């Protein structure tokens, strides 16, 4: 896995991905 | 006035007793047969009738025709038992009256014979709340009682008593009404009461007393206030619904059917009223526990939550376990963070935002 | 120093009547049997005076021994009557006890209730000056094994019919507190007069089953009944009994599931269950949970125990019904998502 | 109540603070059991209390000598839990609060001794504040403590600290030699076992408490290599828990280290049960382990009332479950 | 000299602020001339329960009638101002918790009032009362006397029991707005004279909850600090606020990956004391701030206006998972707060954390 | 008879106390124009004047002359209020009258009149031990409080308090001194003692201060008695640490090299000279923090740290920051675990082994 990852990982933080973007109501621009 | 259903329906005889019957017949069983103990003892829930059914037991024993299960309610004694102002009929409140200089003085009533009855009746009442030097008072009594003295004691926490006095009496256990024959006294009672009702009001009422008559009548008078002077679908429906504040259910269902819309409305109307959120989260992290289980199994759900039984079986049938199992991890994360975050409705937001829209990675 | 069981007591009154009586163990209802008997072979032997007291720091021993010295006009045939503390007598309470011991008379008649002495309260200076002149009568709860025996002849000298199935059904219903069994026969008699008591009948009285018995639904659990571990928990939970004991039992049924699981490996279960000392009657289910679940379960179900006790007794939540019945389900063949277990 | 030799050099100073009038109303005395911090505060107290001072030692001749020896001076002062308690109430400190405001019987130097400050309640610390921070003349006030941080930090802050260090290595280690006959290192690892202090070793080897820990290092020789720690349970289910818990930390410590690669060991008298966890265990296994263990052992000293075979038999279940392959191991976080 | 919380206690029901419904309610009831005989207030603290039934008691025992508009002159309505009114029993259920005390006020209930036409019972803190006490008070309750009337007042109504709850009216206070209390704070200060300022006025309603009580002590205690008036600059030293606009600056310069800023910002705080803690409440606020306004463009509130746009900006430009990512990381490092060797090391620590982890510039790798 | 330095430079006007400008700014204000409250809340951490405050503001309301901010300090009252014997000033111990009882007697008795001053004023310290009951047999006298009474409360937990306590009453809240605060005043005193000191010796008793002036002065207190009367670098550093600063920087680059042998020789060094693991756990944390705050900007290193640059500067330069911020994070959970581990060493050499791991 990637190097940042794991670091994450033994630092506890959990990383959060979308999973149904259609339900966020707004302008929110995550592409670029 | 109309006076209080509770109040102007005392059960009088042993037939407007509702349920009971394993008592009540053993009760004239042992009267006809003549087989009477020193000491009684009813246990049970809140309004259960367990002071009532000592009252008819002691009016039975005294009554002027005999020691009969059916009293005839006529005589002097009778008469004089229902008003309460008989003689040989003592009512003791044990709450009210705990050291032992209060007891001692009604204990030491015994050595006189009694007036105008068989037998000299003493009902206490809340027995539990006794000092441990009333409880030995009562043990001294109670080890060489007099032929002509009778004890009636009615409590809600037999186990507070010593097991000294336990084994010296006979106790009888009362269970819950049910929900037929609480309905079908509540439709008796307004009827005699010549206030308009509807099958579906006391169904509802029936339901929401939970086993308990006296919650029953309570109800029904609550409605009768909200209803003025009337019971009906609506004002009993209105009066639950005041007591029912179902925000957790509706957000739980909001967002397994992701509508952020119906979220923010719920929780808006949430924090109108004074809630913790953490609370909030706890009922939601049970509600979904309660879906998981019922789907393990349907016999999960008992008749506890007979109010949201249509909801949760809905729920349970339709949501996958997948989603059910995140929305738990997500929801015992949320509750985990819940403390650092900058305040308890923006972290409660945030979790429902990710729960909604957002999903973890897990390593590897 | 005479020993006897309470049906013997009866005998050794009618053969006659000793200066002093202990009634030592941890059955109310057979103490008070005991007691009931004495008093009334004293009081037809002549005992019309009785007294009683309670041991306790807190002791005026000086009108004991008031009454030990003092004689009486008319009233004499003196019966007195002391009540030990549940943990035991101590030092000043030997010696207090020795003091009334050497103060004894004729006509005073002494009887000692208490829970049973160990060897450090029997070898003692007022327990030996007894030794030639007491009898005592040890009364404790008999084991379920012994149960349906004291059950079928309590029934018997009742003058009452119980079938196999109602003797076992009052058993299963009233394990361990034989003054409830006792109550409930005699309420059943008096529902019946003839005195007939099919398993039907006792099933009707069964519909109360009040509280106080979680064995119940660990036994549910034992034996995979899901529906029914899931109604007796509810049950329970109507009824507001204490979620430590319902833990305490299933922990303590858990602790031995786990060893006999682990080292069965190598050896069969009925052995396992010989050298544990079990009970048939349990071994039964609990094999049915050894043969049911895997070492995975067992294992999970330990980890949620632990995690509900430790919170139970840092945190004292009130939500520990919700994880009883997750428990209960994970004790079941259910899968389970392993997510509520917190793992 | 032995007065060890190396309480010496400590003592001569702080008597001469005393013959100089530079001491302070309240001293705090950290060291660890068995360091006879008892002993220093009792002999401060007869220095103190003798009408007749000379040199750095009392009398031992003159009225209030006399007195201490027979334990019955009246300007004298101890606070300590009841037999059957485990704490200090605050009644304790009320009652001697308000007994030292009026004089002294015998017109001298009022001393107090608290036995141990971390067996004070809340209450009993607050209330005993503004009694510390203004005494009366003449009132000296002696406490002792294994973790200063563990007491309040208003009370802490009104207390000059004195720390008392354990001797050198050999000479505990010759000291315990005269004492007890065992392998040296037999003494050895029992000296550091309980962080180089002496007595706390001696207690060990005169007790059983070294035949349990053998019996432990047997059962963990047999479990490691087949691999079942159950077994453990028996071993470590007794009243004294904690301190086989910390032994057998130390052993995954030493193994761990070992592993690292390291020339000192505190299991120096077991080489081949370390090196066999070693060998069998990788060192994020061990870790893994050694902190589910200290983890338990702190719930147990903290938790009251917690059922301790349960625990047990929990911890050694998640080891076992840990061994397996592909099992998510736990990481410390806030 | 007076305290303000008091002084401007409601007189009339034209002075209360907000509760529309309640009012209308007790005013229809007033007029129909349909009273109940027990009514039960549930609602955030200081919201005006207390107020109300007294409200209530004036207009139910005034000298002139039964109406929905006390007069407030007659000699019943000022003696329920100053308190000394002998026909209202006014009971304080935290202190008084004990079965006895209940049974010895119910004992007198009987009795007909010593002037007025009812006697009106005030239960202030009636969630103390023991178990026994609230089944002592059923059979009374629902069977008052002619004369007797019953109003509760709580704040935890939950932990009464179902059966005293269905002997009352219920009537749930809300929480005011924070419109609300900045214009009741302007009218109070305009009619004392004292000078203020929007802003002020504004942070202090914002730092008062919903509760006027808090809002007004706050605004006794800034007057005191200020110096005989009310300043921005006062009000943000008695409440400690930094700056928003720093705040914002910081996230910013968090966000473009350039430490320097950072530490330029770090340093300007520290020239002037600023509460690091508080900083960092600040940042976690904005960034769930920030987060809302990507899930609702409505979620952004007036009083951020002079910022709206700004924080517009990012809501266009930075991912939702980079803003989960800061919040994340401000948490943590806010956790870890109490156990760094100082809490500007841990600031700084937690904020080189957070830009080393950067999604889109982490800092430079070493050779 | 001899009184330590906290009991004798009790400050004795408002102008002999150090910081809580706003305070005492806010309290002559309202002195000034007669604008007085009924009740006064202090809040804060401990040892930073609460008591000593409202003894002036006790002092300025019964002054002979009038009520001012600045107390004659030479009339009679005020001579007996420093002595701690007027009779129209009660002070109350609320940690050892937590007793309802108590609280309704004294409230009994407000009715009289106050005997020599104008203003019968009271004083309950550590308020937040006050029983419940306490609490609500107060709000009502509190609320209303007679014309000739003052009703003055310092507390250091205010948050167990209850709101309605809060809301009655004009809180002020005392802001924690800054080192070089800390160090000024300790100058101050000495050199109106007459006490040798240099400037070292002064900032390690200000930085283990820990914003508590009550234990600066008793650090000071107990240096200056272990040092034969004199306050030297050398005798700080010897009832300190210190010793570490080197120590330190070697412990942490064996840590970054993965190098076990050494790490465990220098910790069992450590362990024989019988060094505080705390202070050791700090150092390295700093340490860290500094290396992490170099390799952003390289002027951001201390000028004062000008001995170890050489080896500061690699370490920075070799490591990339999220291995210093996993080695900080290590050594935060290590510090937070100390206490609760069997042994001090035993839970630093845990959180040392967890740190090795950190390299491939
Ligand atoms: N079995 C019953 N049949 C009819 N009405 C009942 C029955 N049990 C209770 N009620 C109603 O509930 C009222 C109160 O019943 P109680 O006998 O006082 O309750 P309870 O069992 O005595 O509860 P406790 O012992 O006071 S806690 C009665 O006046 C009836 O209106
Ligand atoms: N709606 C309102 N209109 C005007 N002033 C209000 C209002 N609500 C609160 N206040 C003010 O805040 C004070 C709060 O008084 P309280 O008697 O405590 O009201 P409360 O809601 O009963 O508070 P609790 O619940 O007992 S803490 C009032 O005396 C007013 O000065
Ligand atoms: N602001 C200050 N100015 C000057 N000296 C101070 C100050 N704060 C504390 N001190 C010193 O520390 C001693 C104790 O201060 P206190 O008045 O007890 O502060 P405190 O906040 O009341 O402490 P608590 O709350 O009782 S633990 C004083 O006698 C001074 O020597
Ligand atoms: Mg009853
Ligand atoms: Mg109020
Ligand atoms: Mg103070
Ligand atoms: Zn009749
Ligand atoms: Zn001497
Ligand atoms: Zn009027
Ligand atoms: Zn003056």
């Known amino acids: ?32 | 006035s109309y006076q209080v259903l509770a109040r102007k329906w005392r059960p009088q005889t042993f037939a407007d007793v509702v349920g009971q019957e394993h008592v009540l017949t053993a009760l004239a069983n042992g009267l006809s047969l003549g087989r009477i103990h020193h000491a009684y003892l009813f246990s049970g829930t809140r309004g259960v009738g367990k002071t009532s059914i000592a009252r008819l037991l002691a009016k039975g024993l005294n009554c002027e025709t005999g020691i009969t299960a059916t009293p005839c309610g006529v005589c002097d004694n009778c008469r004089e038992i229902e008003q309460g102002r008989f003689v040989d009929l003592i009512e003791i409140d044990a709450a009210s009256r705990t050291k032992v200089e209060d007891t001692r003085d009604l204990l030491d009533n015994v050595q006189y014979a009694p007036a105008r009855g068989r037998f000299k009746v003493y009902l206490i009442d809340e027995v539990h709340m006794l000092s441990r030097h009333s409880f030995n008072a009562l043990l001294k009594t109670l080890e060489e009682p007099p032929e002509h003295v009778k004890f009636l004691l009615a409590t809600t926490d037999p186990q507070k008593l010593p097991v000294t006095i336990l084994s010296r009496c006979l106790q009888f256990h009362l269970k819950a009404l049910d929900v037929e024959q609480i309905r079908h006294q509540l439709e008796h009672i307004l009827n005699e009461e010549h206030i308009a009702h509807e099958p579906r009001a006391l169904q509802l009422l029936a339901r929401a007393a939970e086993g308990s008559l006296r919650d029953a009548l309570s109800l029904t008078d609550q409605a009768i206030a909200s209803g003025d002077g009337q019971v009906s679908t609506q004002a009993v429906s209105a009066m639950l619904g005041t007591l029912d504040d179902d925000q957790a259910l509706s957000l739980v269902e909001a967002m397994v059917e992701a509508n952020g819309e119906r979220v923010m409305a719920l929780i808006n109307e949430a924090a109108a009223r004074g809630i913790e959120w953490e609370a909030l989260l706890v009922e939601m992290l049970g509600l979904l526990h309660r879906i998981a289980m019922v789907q393990l199994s349907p016999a999960a759900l008992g008749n506890d939550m007979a109010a949201i039984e249509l909801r949760m079986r809905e729920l349970a049938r339709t949501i996958p376990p997948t989603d059910i199992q995140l929305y738990y991890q997500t929801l015992l994360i949320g509750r985990k963070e819940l403390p650092y975050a900058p305040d308890r409705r923006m972290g409660v937001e945030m979790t429902l935002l990710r729960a909604l829209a957002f999903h973890p990675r897990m390593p590897l | 120093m005479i020993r006897l069981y309470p049906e013997q007591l009866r005998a050794q009154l009618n053969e006659g009547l000793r200066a002093a009586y202990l009634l030592l163990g941890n059955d109310p209802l057979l103490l008070q049997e005991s007691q009931d008997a004495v008093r009334q072979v004293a009081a037809a032997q002549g005992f019309e005076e009785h007294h009683t007291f309670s041991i306790d720091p807190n002791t005026d021993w000086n009108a004991i021994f008031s009454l030990c010295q003092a004689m009486s006009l008319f009233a004499s045939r003196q019966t007195l009557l002391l009540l030990l503390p549940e943990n035991g007598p101590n030092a000043a309470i030997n010696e207090q006890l020795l003091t009334l011991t050497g103060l004894l008379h004729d006509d005073l008649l002494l009887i000692v209730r208490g829970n049973k002495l160990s060897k450090a309260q029997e070898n003692a200076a007022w327990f030996t000056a007894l030794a030639n002149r007491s009898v005592q009568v040890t009364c404790q709860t008999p084991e379920q094994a012994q149960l349906p025996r004291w059950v079928a002849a309590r029934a018997k000298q009742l003058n009452l019919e119980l079938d196999d199935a109602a003797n076992q059904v009052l058993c299963y219903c009233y394990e361990g507190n034989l003054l409830a069994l006792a109550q409930a026969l005699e309420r059943l008699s008096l529902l019946w007069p003839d005195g007939k008591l099919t398993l039907p009948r006792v099933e009707q009285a069964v519909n109360d089953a009040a509280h106080f018995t979680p064995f119940h639904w660990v036994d549910a659990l034992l034996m995979g009944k899901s529906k029914r571990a899931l109604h007796i928990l509810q049950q329970l939970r109507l009824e507001g009994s204490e979620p430590v004991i319902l833990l305490r039992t299933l922990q303590r049924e858990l602790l031995l599931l786990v060893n006999l699981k682990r080292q069965s490996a190598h050896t069969p279960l009925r052995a396992l269950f010989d050298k544990h000392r079990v009970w048939q009657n349990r071994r039964g289910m609990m094999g049915e949970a050894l043969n049911r679940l895997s070492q995975t379960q067992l294992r999970q179900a330990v980890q949620l125990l632990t995690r509900t006790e430790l919170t139970l007794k840092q945190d004292y939540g009130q939500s520990v019904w919700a994880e009883l019945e997750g428990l209960s389900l994970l004790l079941c063949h259910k899968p389970l998502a392993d997510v509520f277990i917190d793992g | 109540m032995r007065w060890y030799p190396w309480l010496r050099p400590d003592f001569e100073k702080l008597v001469a603070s005393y013959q100089a009038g530079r001491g302070h109303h309240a001293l705090l005395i950290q060291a660890l059991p068995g360091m006879g911090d008892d002993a220093l505060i009792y002999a401060l107290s007869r220095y103190l209390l003798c009408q007749q001072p000379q040199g750095h030692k009392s009398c031992g001749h003159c009225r209030g000598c006399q007195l201490m020896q027979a334990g019955t001076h009246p300007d004298y002062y101890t606070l300590a839990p009841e037999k059957g308690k485990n704490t200090l109430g605050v009644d304790a400190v009320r009652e001697v609060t308000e007994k030292l405001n009026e004089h002294a019987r015998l017109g001298g130097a009022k001393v107090v001794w608290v036995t141990d400050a971390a067996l004070l309640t809340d209450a009993a610390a607050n209330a005993l504040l503004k009694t510390l921070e203004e005494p009366p003349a003449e009132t000296w006030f002696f406490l002792a403590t294994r973790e200063p941080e563990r007491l309040l930090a208003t009370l802490r802050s009104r207390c000059r600290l004195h720390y008392l260090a354990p001797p050198p290595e050999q000479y505990a280690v010759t000291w315990l030699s005269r004492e007890v006959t065992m392998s040296q290192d037999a003494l050895l690892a029992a000296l550091r076992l309980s962080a180089g202090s002496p007595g706390a070793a001696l207690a060990l080897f005169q007790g059983d408490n070294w035949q349990a820990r053998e019996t432990l290092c047997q059962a963990l020789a047999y479990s490691v290599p087949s691999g079942d720690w159950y077994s453990l349970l028996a071993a470590l289910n007794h009243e004294q828990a904690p301190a086989r818990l910390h032994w057998l930390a130390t052993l995954l410590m030493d193994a761990l280290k070992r592993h690292h690669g390291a020339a000192q060991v505190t299991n120096v008298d077991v080489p081949g049960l370390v090196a066999e966890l070693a060998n069998h265990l990788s060192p994020s296994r061990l870790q893994a382990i050694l902190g589910d263990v200290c983890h338990i052992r702190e719930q147990l000293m903290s938790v009251t009332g917690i059922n301790r075979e349960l625990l047990i038999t929990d911890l050694l279940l998640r080891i076992e479950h840990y061994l397996q392959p592909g099992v998510v191991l736990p990481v410390p976080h806030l």
Do not use: C, V
Request: hydrophobic share 40%.
């Open chain 1, 1 to 32: 896995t990637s190097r940042r990852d794991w670091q994450l990982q033994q630092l506890g933080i959990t990383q959060w991905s979308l999973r149904r973007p259609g339900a966020l109501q707004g302008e929110i621009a995550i592409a670029i």
